[PDB]
Amino acid sequence: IKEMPQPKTFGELKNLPLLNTDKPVQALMKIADELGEIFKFEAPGRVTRYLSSQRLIKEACDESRFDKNLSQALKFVRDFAGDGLFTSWTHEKNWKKAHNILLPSFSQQAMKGYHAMMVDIAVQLVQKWERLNADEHIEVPEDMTRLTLDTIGLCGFNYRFNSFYRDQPHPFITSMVRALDEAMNKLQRANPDDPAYDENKRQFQEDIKVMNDLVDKIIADRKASGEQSDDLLTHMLNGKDPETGEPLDDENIRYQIITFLIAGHETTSGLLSFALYFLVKNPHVLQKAAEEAARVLVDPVPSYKQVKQLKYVGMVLNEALRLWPTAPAFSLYAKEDTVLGGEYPLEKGDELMVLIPQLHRDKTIWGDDVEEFRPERFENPSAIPQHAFKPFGNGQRACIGQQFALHEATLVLGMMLKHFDFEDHTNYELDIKETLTLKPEGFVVKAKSKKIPL
Ligand code: HEM
Numbered sequence: 001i002k003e004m005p006q007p008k009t010f011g012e013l014k015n016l017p018l019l020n021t022d023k024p025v026q027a028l029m030k031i032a033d034e035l036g037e038i039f040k041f042e043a044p045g046r047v048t049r050y051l052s053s054q055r056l057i058k059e060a061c062d063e064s065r066f067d068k069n070l071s072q073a074l075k076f077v078r079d080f081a082g083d084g085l086f087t088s089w090t091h092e093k094n095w096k097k098a099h100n101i102l103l104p105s106f107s108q109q110a111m112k113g114y115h116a117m118m119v120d121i122a123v124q125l126v127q128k129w130e131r132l133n134a135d136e137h138i139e140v141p142e143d144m145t146r147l148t149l150d151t152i153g154l155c156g157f158n159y160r161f162n163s164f165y166r167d168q169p170h171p172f173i174t175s176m177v178r179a180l181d182e183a184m185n186k187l188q189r190a191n192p193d194d195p196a197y198d199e200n201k202r203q204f205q206e207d208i209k210v211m212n213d214l215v216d217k218i219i220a221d222r223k224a225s226g227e228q229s230d231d232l233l234t235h236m237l238n239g240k241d242p243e244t245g246e247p248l249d250d251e252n253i254r255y256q257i258i259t260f261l262i263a264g265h266e267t268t269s270g271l272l273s274f275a276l277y278f279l280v281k282n283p284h285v286l287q288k289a290a291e292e293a294a295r296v297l298v299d300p301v302p303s304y305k306q307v308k309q310l311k312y313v314g315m316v317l318n319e320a321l322r323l324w325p326t327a328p329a330f331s332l333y334a335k336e337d338t339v340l341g342g343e344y345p346l347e348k349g350d351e352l353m354v355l356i357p358q359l360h361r362d363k364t365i366w367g368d369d370v371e372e373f374r375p376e377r378f379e380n381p382s383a384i385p386q387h388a389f390k391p392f393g394n395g396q397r398a399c400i401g402q403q404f405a406l407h408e409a410t411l412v413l414g415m416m417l418k419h420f421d422f423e424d425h426t427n428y429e430l431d432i433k434e435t436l437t438l439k440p441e442g443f444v445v446k447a448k449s450k451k452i453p454l
């Protein structure tokens with residue numbers, strides 16, 4: 001029974017000022033490097049414990065002992081994502097109902113139906129880059145975000161955001177990005193109810209109204225027309241939960257659509273951006289991935305079955321998720337009193353944060369080459385210890401979008417490596433911007449066409 005380390009305190013504010021930074025996850029990573037596999041973090045009125053070791057996280061991932069907690073970040077996102085899957089408690093009726101209704105829409109099988117839509121957007125990205133002039137470069141996270149938002153819009157509700165036709169984001173997106181910024185900024189405020197934050201609160205309410213009005217009109221317009229497109233919205237209007245026999249209500253459908261647009265904007269785009277970053281920093285790895293793409297993608301348009309055969313590209317994406325998991329944490333609560341790792345007693349209700357980037361750096365799992373980009377680490381999942389690799393979270397509350405994200409990312413990265421050579425022309429220094437998620441900021445490359453027709 002050990003006493004837990006705790007980082008430096010600021011009197012009555014305890015640890016809270018440590019998060020007064022534009023890079024709080026990267027600050028918590030540096031604290032974990034100093035304090036080790038577990039530390040206590042206190043703010044006025046709340047305590048959590050940050051876990052970094054596979055030794056403790058494998059226990060935290062025991063669903064008989066721990067359930068998903070809404071972190072303060074998720075509670076603030078819930079003001080616009082409601083009781084959508086991502087911001088619902090496991091015990092709320094609408095979690096299991098929506099989970100049962102939506103699981104078939106997110107399976108490996110369902111991906112065959114979404115593939116043609118994903119290819120539509122992927123072809124738009126390839127044509128954009130084919131059409132750049134000799135003097136020009138690519139804004140990587142900008143273009144990956146254009147792609148991943150457009151893909152979920154088209155597969156979500158058959159809506160074209162037409163992001164490759166715009167410098168300025170669609171108005172829904174300007175509102176969603178500003179709401180996500182206010183949710184994440186609200187975290188840092190020692191003094192939240194101050195009047196210096198009164199404009200922020202007024203803007204948040206306008207942004208919520210914007211997201212609701214576009215999404216509610218999309219739903220209303222679809223029911224009115226009665227058309228049956230094979231998108232998530234059609235599945236949610238016609239689907240019944242096998243348990244309750246009930247469908248989702250129109251308000252819950254709107255929370256699910258907002259949730260899916262947040263995920264498509266924030267997470268998959270981060271993964272593609274980090275994957276291209278590691279490939280241009282690791283030319284031998286880029287070469288082996290480009291060789292797979294050339295051998296497998298033998299048709300102008302990739303097929304679903306071809307994407308399934310891009311195994312090495314799959315390993316590249318997992319190794320990018322290992323070093324920079326774009327969704328960097330999740331939160332758990334103890335269902336009952338229990339002891340963590342035979343050292344740290346917890347009471348019913350005590351909270352934990354899993355710091356995924358640190359878990360993925362555990363040298364007892366990955367060895368001394370832990371900072372190196374080596375996709376071959378992922379050749380044999382049976383050779384990886386339990387709960388060592390958690391970029392999609394844990395158990396019944398794991399990412400429902402995992403198959404969707406990995407299909408889209410494998411397809412697009414495979415087409416990028418087929419069609420272009422890449423140059424890191426600025427010798428880019430990694431700068432990680434934090435929103436809901438992690439993304440390279442300012443990452444730019446030059447892409448020289450291999451002139452292979454679409
Ligand atoms: C690389 C891409 C992505 C990553 C890394 C990612 C990561 C995660 C993680 C870590 C969680 C667990 C969060 C927690 O325990 O608090 C999660 C949940 C979720 N993700 Fe994703 N996600 C990705 C893409 C997507 C996509 C494309 C969708 C939907 C189109 C999506 C929808 C969701 C939903 C709905 C949940 C909540 C599931 C539930 O609790 O029932 N994600 N994601």
Ligand SMILES: CCCCCCCN1CCC[C@H]1C(=O)N[C@@H](Cc1ccccc1)C(=O)O
Nearest residue numbers: 019024025071072073187327328329353436
């Ligand atoms: C993909 C979603 C990732 C969300 C990860 C959370 C991302 N947080 C952003 C800051 C770091 C990280 C986190 O540890 N937050 C906790 C801690 C906390 C609670 C209350 C006030 C301030 C901070 C929380 O939100 O409860």
